[PDB]
Amino acid sequence: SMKKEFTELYDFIFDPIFLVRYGYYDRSIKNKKMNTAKVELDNEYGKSDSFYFKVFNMESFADYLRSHDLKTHFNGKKPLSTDPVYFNIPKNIEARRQYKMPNLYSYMALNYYICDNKKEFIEVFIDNKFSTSKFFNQLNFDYPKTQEITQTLLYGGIKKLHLDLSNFYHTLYTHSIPWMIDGKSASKQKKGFSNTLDTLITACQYDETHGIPTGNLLSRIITELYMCHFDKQMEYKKFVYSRYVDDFIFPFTFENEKQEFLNEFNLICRENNLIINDNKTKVDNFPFVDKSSKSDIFSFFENITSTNSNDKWIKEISNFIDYCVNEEHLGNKGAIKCIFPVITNTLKQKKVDTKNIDNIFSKRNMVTNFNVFEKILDLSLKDSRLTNKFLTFFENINEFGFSSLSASNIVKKYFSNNSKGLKEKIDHYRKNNFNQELYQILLYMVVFEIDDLLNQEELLNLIDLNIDDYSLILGTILYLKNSSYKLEKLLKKIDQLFINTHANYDVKTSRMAEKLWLFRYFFYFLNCKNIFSQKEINSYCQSQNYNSGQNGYQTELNWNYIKGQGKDLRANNFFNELIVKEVWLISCGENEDFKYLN
Amino acid sequence: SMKKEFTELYDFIFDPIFLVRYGYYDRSIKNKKMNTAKVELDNEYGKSDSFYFKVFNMESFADYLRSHDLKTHFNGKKPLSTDPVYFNIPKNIEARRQYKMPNLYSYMALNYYICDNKKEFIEVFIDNKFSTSKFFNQLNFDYPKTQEITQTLLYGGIKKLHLDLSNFYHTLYTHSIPWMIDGKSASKQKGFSNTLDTLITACQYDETHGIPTGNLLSRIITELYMCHFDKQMEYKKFVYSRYVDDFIFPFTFENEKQEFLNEFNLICRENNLIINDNKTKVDNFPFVDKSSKSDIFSFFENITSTNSNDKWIKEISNFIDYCVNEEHLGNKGAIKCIFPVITNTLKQKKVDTKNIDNIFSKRNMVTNFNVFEKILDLSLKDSRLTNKFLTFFENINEFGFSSLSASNIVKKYFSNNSKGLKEKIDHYRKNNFNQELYQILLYMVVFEIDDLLNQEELLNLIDLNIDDYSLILGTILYLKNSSYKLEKLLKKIDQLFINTHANYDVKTSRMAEKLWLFRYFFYFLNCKNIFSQKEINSYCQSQNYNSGQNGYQTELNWNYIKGQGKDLRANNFFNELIVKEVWLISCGENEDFKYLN
Amino acid sequence: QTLLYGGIKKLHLDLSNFYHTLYTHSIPWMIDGKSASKQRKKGFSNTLDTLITACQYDETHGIPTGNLLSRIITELYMCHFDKQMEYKKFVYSRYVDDFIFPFTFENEKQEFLNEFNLICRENNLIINDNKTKVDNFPFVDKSSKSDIF
Amino acid sequence: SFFENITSTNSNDKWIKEISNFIDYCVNEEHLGNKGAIKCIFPVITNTLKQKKVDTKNIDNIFSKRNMVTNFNVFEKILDLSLKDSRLTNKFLTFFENINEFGFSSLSASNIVKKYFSNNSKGLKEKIDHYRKNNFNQELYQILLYMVVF
DNA sequence: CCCCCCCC
DNA sequence: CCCCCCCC
DNA sequence: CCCCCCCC
DNA sequence: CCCCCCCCC
Ligand SMILES: [Mg+2]
Ligand SMILES: [Mg+2]
Ligand SMILES: [Mg+2]
Ligand SMILES: [Mg+2]
Ligand SMILES: [Mg+2]
């Protein structure tokens, strides 16, 4: 029944290996049988809107976890205050949203706690009746099903009321969590479940309390419980509504029903320091607006056949992209995100010949220079949140017959033509800390083997402060892929960065508790694998006259010296086990060549 | 010079006795001579927009400070975390603001620190160039002078960019105060700012979300924060005018605008500040100016004392409508000018004392219209006008308006609108619009309104989700009625004290918890024996309370409560105040809880 | 489509009554140069002008629209416009008098407008300010005929 | 009818304040579509002085007082106003040329304008280079003319 | 995995 | 000419 | 030169 | 104290 199939989903999700194999990057699997014991690093089962699975994933760390028990490292209390990877992405054309990717250690510390107390989450979730985000887009709980749950919650409503909470994730006071779960008066009196959660959550953001570290499934799960206690307080007051995260739909029929619900709603926000986004408060009167019909979109290619001209397919695809971008302008939320899936599905459904698919996306018209793949590429450069979608779209038409080389050339030519504008855009993303925008360009260059855009001086200028770890890793990979460039200059800019950021901390702080922990692990891993010639390391170390001991060179570059520095080594000893067992957090590639297409 | 007048302002403000006598309730005096050694019981020298001076003031505590030195009592470490008075006021008809009135002990600790390190405030203040809010509306630093400062900052500007920070005080991340004063990266590693943060948190029970807003100390702390925001923008060759969180950036080319916006956002993102995108506008030249009061101040330029009293009634009544409509159009603060210019016009036009009684206490037999009843009714449409209305009444009282006639007029209002007022009272309770409640209760105690709430309705005010101030007023209302038995009131107060202590570690001292003001008010009265000690021992024997060396072992007995906590630094502070007969609430001239002349 | 790449926004710019208000004597200016034109006959530019005015009784207000010769001369004129703009590292798409300027920073839209207005004042061209509009991504497009066809 | 209530008895500060308030009133009036309101600033300030018969030394101090607290000067504000529309170049200069004959010291007029140029030297040079590049002829003429006049 | 594709 | 059709 | 002042 | 009176959080 309903109670049965609910618990199947939750007994599945609440598993430490699942919450890092798919939770760290907020990935989602449709079927349980996709949780293979193999690494399965090449192909994608699940999807995510965040980071490229091929270059950044946990499949190596996951395969370690089902062969080794790591809870030993976390069984103690008093967790370590680690610094996350601050990664800032856009919200509109003129607004932003701040992700924080927590240090893997303090993440697993929080992960194991949530699982050791799965009951305090699950039994509240299954009893809850208003939330359509408590499924986390997981398993068979797709968009049509969350929509269908909302429809039954809005019966009897001549009108609908909308409320959105303003910057809910990033303005959340962490100490509000014991208030919502246990009661504000009960928390004023220590060492409970809510209190221990609060201290583990802040451990992932260097003990700061303004906001939650958003960007992973754990934050999603913790956020859903906080709002499910909201839902429970409103159920006591005999209210009924639908809710997806911070977005409410209250159905009513008389103005007083609305004002009653509005007042009891404000009392809960006042009590828990939540701010109602007033620009988004709206009452919909029947006949009800609904500007989200995808029927016209999904039926765009109805009258096209495999027998249609390759030029016909080119024009219709290009036509279709413009139709959806216009539909998003009219308020059809998600219409642009649908461009990639339906082009993929339509080619498959119409069974276009694999040779004919190459021509469609390879054809550069010598009359107008139009290549439809170039158009899709340029589209994706208009919202860096489309990065994974464009890359999996290429992945799909690639395995359909689009020449990996043809695609690499088209992308190369696009960068060549827009060289001036992209350089200008990079300097902007660097000065104003637009991470994902810089990430997208760097990820495109490493993936499509682009080498003409930046020189070595312009590449080393990327290895600097106020750059996310993901961009640094990508920029490092770009430097290494040119064999002509000498590693000596790269080691200076990297070591200079490592010393500079370690200086801001207390001198007794372990380096794996600091910033740049992911880029640090990436470097130490490549160094232990000796991608950096141990000789070419000693050459640099002697240009700075670095003292030496039995650990090796006393440099931030040497992991063996770093592995011991600091009073609390629980983090260093954590990432130590990972380096020894050659667990990677960044994927070298199929041939370990840092090439990512076939 | 310009810095010559600043240094004199700040050497005066940054004095701990001034910062509580005029800063706790955010008062303002126009002359340094107004800081008299005497307790100004009948002189409202200062101006405030928060709490009625005649009832809630620090003049007695200020008097104790001139004699004793409490810097000795406060020197130490790890300050005690106290719970403030949560007092919620409106922002507009549909919005609210959250004032937090800090425990006196925690407040004074912050006050002494700021003064011992006034150097770190004053040095940044004098050096500042962009802030017109850094004068805190004191001395000869009036609105016209601040506008004159802004005008010289907007030269060379064809356009003005307007930028407002969203929910600034309440959303201000406290730990970001070290970030702006000494840098964020350096803060990863217990200096000046690192301790100012922990003194601030201890005023709001170690909450790090928001600043205790409603007093001068928080305005100065907020100002340092933004004055460092200013130094960062000054290093980038930017010029603008700022008042608290509201910026005016003059520019000419769209280059300069986007240049300014990009840096502005970086500073904001770094310190968890949020920009109110709705109040973001650009004024192209010719510039709008919807805030000119020239027509308001010259409203009475045509009327004289020779004119009929009925004409004065009409022009005043038509003047109130002119200003309320001008506030509608965007002339910000126009309603706040109604009371001053009426008072200043009456004085300047030299209106006789007997005429003022007749102008303001006349009842049209035809229309039942009384102009003072109108002004009162206006004051109840925005509870942030309570102090304005009462200081206005205080002024026409001294000019001739009979205290008796005024009390009768308000009494009549409350009788006509018993249905509505009792609806609004029970509304403000259920939604913690606790200022709107404080106003009604304050009008009742001041104007002697004994016919609105019965005994039961008053007792049902002594509950939780009621702020200390309205609690004190509701208790006063009960006491002002002799025929109400003091026994029932105790049972509501004892139950209330008992219920809020249950929310704490049993080792917590009561004077560190919530309701610290109401507790002090009650304890002071019991020590003064206002609560008949025979009538106290009667209630305790009813509850079968045990009796010990200090007393009857209840929340009501201060001698027992005095030392029942792990950290008594707070109780020991308030105990000294009770012993020396320092009052935080004025019992009145004859201690009859009456406040009219 | 390929001209508008890299644009998170696109600026629209339409000349007002370009065909009917075009000063014929500005045609030599665009092809050769206003300064050079002061120096003054027998050139290709000047002779083209005279063959044009001869079609409309030696009048210089506007070009006689309705035929293809006027379209061709209009393109040549407007292409020398394009070259002056190309020289300044600007990129856009134009159909006769209708410009589409893709950009990403307001600094660019301003740089572009400043030089655009400079050529327009030099050659007595008028911007139709009613049709000036920027489109922010996601871009509107109402020109779709898919459901019609 | 803006200055009708004020007379010679009022303090120079009052006069300075009221004139400063008056410039804002007309500027806002022009913003509302009151075509010509800004061009009326200069005559009615001149003519109000005549009708009210303010003493010569008062004219100097009104237009020379640098308020020690704000460092505001009402003549400097008038000057900054004229640099917002070049077509006010003559109506500002006749205004000075008028109050110069009313008792305003030219040595102070020159000193006040020179301070403005010293203060906004970066901005003014930036604006000059922008006028040459875009062939804005009157805007440049204004700055150059003020330089030679003052 | 066995006519789907989209919300924070 | 050999499943298109529309912009100033 | 003998009160004013502003439209394009 | 010796005319004034208004911005915010
Ligand atoms: Mg939101
Ligand atoms: Mg604000
Ligand atoms: Mg046209
Ligand atoms: Mg046209
Ligand atoms: Mg504000």
DSSP per position, C12-40: EEEBSSHHHH-BTTHHHHHHT-HHHHH--
Å between A329 CA and nearest CA of chain B: 21
Helix pair A404-417, A435-447: axis angle to 10 deg = 130
- The three-state secondary structure class of A89 is strand
Smallest CA-to-CA distance from B108 within B10, B210, B169, B24 is with: B24
Burial, B548: exposed, middle or buried (Cβ in 10 Å; 0-12, 13-18, 19+)?
A: exposed
Burial C10-36 (b: 16+ CB within 10 A, else e): bbebbbeebbeebebebbbbbbbeeee
Tell me whether residues D135 and C121 touch, CB distance under 8 A: yes
Q: Which ranges of B502-568 does DSSP label H, i.e. alpha helix?
A: 516-527, 533-542, 558-561
* D119–chain B Cβ distance below 8 A for any pair: yes
Rounded to 5 degrees, what are φ and ψ at A208? -70, 155
Which amino acid does the sequence have at A433? N
Ligand nearest to the CA of B247: 5
Closest by Cβ to B158, choosing from D84, D116, D120: D84
Q: What is the rounded distance in angstroms from the CA atom of residue A380 to the CA atom of residue A374?
A: 10
B296 within 8 A of B337, measured Cβ to Cβ:
yes
Amino acid at B391: T
Which residue has the closest alpha carbon to E8 C1'? A245
Q: Which of B165, B174, B189 best probes binding to A when mutated, by most A CB atoms within 10 angstroms?
A: B189
Give, in order, the Cα–Cα distances in Å from B483 to each of B65, B450, B455, B488. Answer: 39, 12, 10, 12
Distance, in Å, from the CA atom of A3 to the CA atom of B417, rounded to the nearest integer, reads 55
In whole angstroms, how far apart are CA B39 and each of B28, B56, B66? 16, 14, 11
Determine the Cα–Cα distance for residues A187 and A177; give it in Å rounded to an integer: 10
Euclidean distance between CA atoms B272 and B420, whole angstroms: 43
Which residues of B contribute to the annotated binding site for Mg(2+)? 164-165, 245-246
Q: Which residues contact A409 (CB under 8 A, 6 or more apart)?
A: none
Nearest to B12 by CA among B2, B22, B26, B25: B22
How deeply is A524 buried, as exposed, middle or buried, from its count of CB atoms within 10 A (0-12, 13-18, 19+)? buried
Q: Which of residues 154-173 of B touch strand H (CB under 7 A)?
A: 164-165, 167-170
Token pair recorded at residue B189? 């590693």
In a 10 Å sphere around its CB, with 0-12 CB exposed, 13-18 middle and 19+ buried, how is residue D121 labelled? exposed
Cα B143 to ligand 5 centroid, rounded to whole Å: 16
Packing angle of the helix pair B516-527, B569-579 (nearest 10 deg): 40
Instruction: Give burial (CB, 10 Å; 0-12/13-18/19+) of A330.
Output: exposed
Q: Which residue in A has a C-alpha nearest to residue B172's C-alpha?
A: A210
* Distance from C-alpha of D17 to C-alpha of D10, rounded to nearest angstrom: 11
% helix, strand, coil for chain C, step of 5: 45, 15, 40
Any idea how long chain C is?
149
Chains adjacent to D (≥3 CB pairs closer than 8 angstroms): B, C
Question: Is the backbone peptide bond immediately before B340 cis, with ω within 30 degrees of 0?
Answer: no
How far apart CA A42 and CA A395 sit, in angstroms, is: 11
Interface check for A500 against chain B (CB to CB < 8 A): the answer is no
Residue type, A85: V
**Cα A410 to Cα D19: distance, rounded to the nearest angstrom:** 67
Strands B159-165 and B246-251: antiparallel
Query: Could you give the angle at the alpha carbon of B474 between the alpha carbons of B468 and B475, nearest 5°?
Result: 90
Contact assessment for residue B431 and residue B467, using Cβ atoms and an 8 Å cutoff: no
Classify D4 as helix, strand or coil: coil
Whole-number Å distance between alpha carbons of A589 and A597: 9
Question: For strand H, is any atom closer than 7 Å to the CB of B243?
Answer: yes
In contact, B243 and B131? CB cutoff 8 Å = yes
Which of the ligands is closest to the CA of residue A281?
A: 1
Distances (CA, A) of A310 to A339, A354, A377, A525: 19, 12, 20, 47
Give the relative orientation of helices A469-481 and A517-528 as an angle to the nearest 10 degrees.
30
How many helices (DSSP H) and strands (DSSP E) are in chain D? Answer: 8, 0
Helix (H, G, I), strand (E, B) or coil at A378: helix
Residues of chain B with Cβ-Cβ distance to C134 below 8 Å are none
**Spatial separation of the C-alpha atoms in residues B573 and B584, rounded to whole Å:** 14
Q: How far apart are CA A562 and CA A513, in angstroms?
A: 12
- Are the C-beta atoms of B359 and B373 separated by less than 8 Å? no
Cα of first residue to Cα of last residue in chain A, in angstroms, is: 46
Which nucleotides of chain F are near protein (any atom < 7 Å from a CB)?
Answer: 3-8
Cβ–Cβ under 8 Å, residues C99 and C105: no
Q: Residue A271 has which token pair?
A: 């009590």
DSSP conformation class of C136: E
Helix residue ranges, H only, B68-154: 71-74, 104-116, 118-127, 143-153
Q: Does B185 touch chain A (CB under 8 A)?
A: yes
Token reading at B558: 């201060």
Q: Which of B374, B231, B243 is nearest to B316 (CA)?
A: B374
Return the SS3 of A250: strand
Query: Which amino acid type is present at position A370?
Result: F
Of B296, B346, B351, residue with least CA distance to B318: B296
Rounded CA gap, B268 and B246, in Å?
A: 13
Question: Can you tell me the distance from the alpha carbon of A132 to that of A150, in angstroms, rounded to the nearest whole number?
Answer: 7
Report which residue is nearest nucleotide H1 when distances run from CA to C1'. Answer: B31
Distance (Å, whole) CA A431 – CA B255: 16
CA distance A516 to A266: 41
A133: nearest Cα among A54, A26, A263: A26
Report how far residue B404's alpha carbon sits from residue B409's, in angstroms, rounded to the nearest whole number.
Answer: 9
Return the number of other C-beta atoms located less than 10 Å from residue D38's C-beta.
Answer: 24
Ligand number nearest to the C-alpha of C15:
3
The Cα C143–Cα A322 span in angstroms is 10
Structural contact between residues B216 and B101, judged by C-beta atoms closer than 8 angstroms: no
B151/D69 Cβ within 8 A: no
Question: What b/e sequence results for B341-375 when a residue is b if at least 16 CB atoms lie within 10 Å of its CB, and e otherwise?
Answer: bbbebbeeeebeeebbbbbbbbeeeeeeebbbbeb
8 A C-beta contact, residue B511 and residue B570? yes
The span from the CA of B24 to the CA of B22, in Å, is 6
Partner B contacted by A175 (CB < 8 A): yes
3-state helix/strand/coil string of D79-143:
HHHHCCCHHHHHHHHHHHHHHHHHCCCHHHHHHHHHHHHHHCHHHHHHHHHHHHHHCCHHHHHHH
**Nearest Cα to D63, choosing from D16, D11, D2, D26?**
D16
Distance from CA of B266 to the nearest CA of A (A): 7
Neighbouring residues of A302: CB distance < 8 A, sequence distance ≥ 6: none
In the numeric block, the tokens 């029932």 are attached to B488
Percent helix, strand and coil across chain D, each to the nearest 5:
70, 0, 30
C95-100 contacts: CB < 8 A, separation 24 or more? C96/C18, C97/C14, C97/C15, C97/C18, C98/C12, C98/C13, C98/C14, C98/C15, C99/C11, C99/C12, C99/C13, C99/C14, C100/C3, C100/C4, C100/C10, C100/C11, C100/C12, C100/C13
Name residues whose C-beta falls within 8 Å of residue B198's C-beta, 6 or more positions apart in sequence: B79
Helical H segments across B128-215, by residue range: 143-153, 168-171, 176-182, 192-203
Rounded Cα distance between B303 and B299, Å, is 9
The answer to whether residue A593 neighbours chain B at the CB level (below 8 Å) is no
Phi, psi (deg, nearest 5) at residue A522: -60, -45
Looking at the DSSP bridge assignments, the partners of residue B276 are: B164
Size of interface A-C (CB pairs under 8 A): 54
Q: Which value, in Å, is the radius of gyration of the alpha carbons in chain B?
A: 26
| Nearest protein residue to nucleotide G6, judged by CA and C1' positions | D36
Per the structure, the residue whose CA is closest to nucleotide E4 at C1' is A345
| Alpha-carbon distance D133 to nearest alpha carbon in chain C (angstroms) | 9
Query: Nearest to residue B293, comparing CAs of D36, D15, D18?
Result: D18
Q: Which helix (H) or strand (E) holds B409?
A: helix B403-416
* φ, ψ dihedrals at A548, nearest 5°: -130, 145
CA of A168 to the centre of ligand 1 (A): 5
| Amino acid (one-letter) located at D54 | V
Tell if B137 CB is < 7 Å from nucleic strand H: yes
Chain D interface disruption, residue of B138, B151, B259, B260, most D CBs within 10 A? B151
Using the structure block, give the residue that is written with the tokens 């009151």.
Answer: D34
Sheet of B275-284, strand order: B241-243, B246-251, B159-165, B275-284
Euclidean distance between the first and the last CA atom of chain C, given in angstroms as a whole number: 22
Q: Is D135 on the interface with C (CB under 8 A)?
A: yes
Per the CB < 8 A criterion, the answer to whether A193 and A290 are in contact is no
Which of D61, D57, D25, D23 lies closest to D42 in space, CA to CA?
A: D23
Structure determined via: X-ray
As a rounded value in angstroms, the CA-to-C1' distance for B340 and H2 is 17
Place of tokens 């006598």: B21
Exposure string over C69-91, b if 16+ CB within 10 A, otherwise e: ebeebbeebbebbeebbeeeebb
- B278 φ/ψ angles, rounded to the nearest 5 degrees: -80, -35
Does D50 contact strand G, using a CB cutoff of 7 Å?
yes
| Distance in angstroms: CA A402, C1' E7 | 32
Q: Using DSSP, how many helices (H) and how many strands (E) does chain C show?
A: 6, 4
Contacts of D4 (CB under 8 A, 6+ apart): none
Tokens found for residue C127: 């911007």
- Return the SS3 of B21: helix
Closest CA to B154 of A515, D76, C15: D76
- The sign of the dihedral angle between the CA atoms of D18, D24, D28, D34 is positive
- A338 CA, H9 C1': Å apart: 45
- The closest of C45, C9, C18, C8 to C126, measured between CA atoms, is C18
Q: What is the largest distance, in Å, between two alpha-carbon atoms of chain B? A: 80
Distance from C-alpha of B78 to C-alpha of D20, rounded to nearest angstrom = 53
3-state per-residue secondary structure call for A184-236:
HHHHCCCCCHHHHHHHHHHHCCCCCCECCCCCCHHHHHHHHHHHHHHHHHHHH
The SS3 of residue B109 is helix
**How far, in Å, CA of A13 to CA of A23, rounded?**
9
Torsion, Cα C57 C62 C68 C71, to 10 degrees, reads 150
AA identity, residue B419:
K
Nearest to B460 by CA among B436, B433, B483, B437: B437
Distance CA B378, CA B389 (A): 9
List own/partner pairs for D13-16 with CB under 8 A and 24 or more apart: D13/D65, D13/D67, D15/D54, D15/D58, D15/D62, D16/D62, D16/D65, D16/D67, D16/D72, D16/D74
Q: How many CB atoms lie within 10 A of CB B252?
A: 17
A42: CA distance to ligand 3 center in Å?
A: 55
Residue type, C102: P
Query: In this structure, what token pair is assigned to residue A547?
Result: 């003292």
- The residues near B310 (Cβ < 8 Å, ≥ 6 apart) are B362
Q: What are the residues facing A86 on neighbouring strands? A: A100
Cis before C138? omega within 30: yes
Per CB-CB distance under 8 Å, the chain D contacts of B144 are 17
Contacts of B103 (CB under 8 A, 6+ apart): B82, B83, B84, B203, B511, B512, B516, B570
- Calpha distance D106→A572 (Å, rounded): 76
Which nucleotides on chain H have any atom < 7 A from a protein Cβ?
A: 1-9
C-alpha to C-alpha distance for B504 and B510, rounded to whole angstroms: 9
**How far off is chain D from B391, nearest CA to CA, in Å?**
27
Answer whether B415 touches C (CB < 8 Å).
no
The first and second tokens of residue B366, run together, are 């035809």
Residue B5's nearest CA partner among B132, B139, B114 is B139
Beta bridge partners of B250: B160
CB of A191 within 8 Å of any CB in chain B? no
| Distance, CA of C78 to C1' of G8, in Å | 33
Phi and psi at A85, nearest 5°, equal -95, 100
Helices B192-203 and B104-116 cross at an angle (nearest 10°) of 160
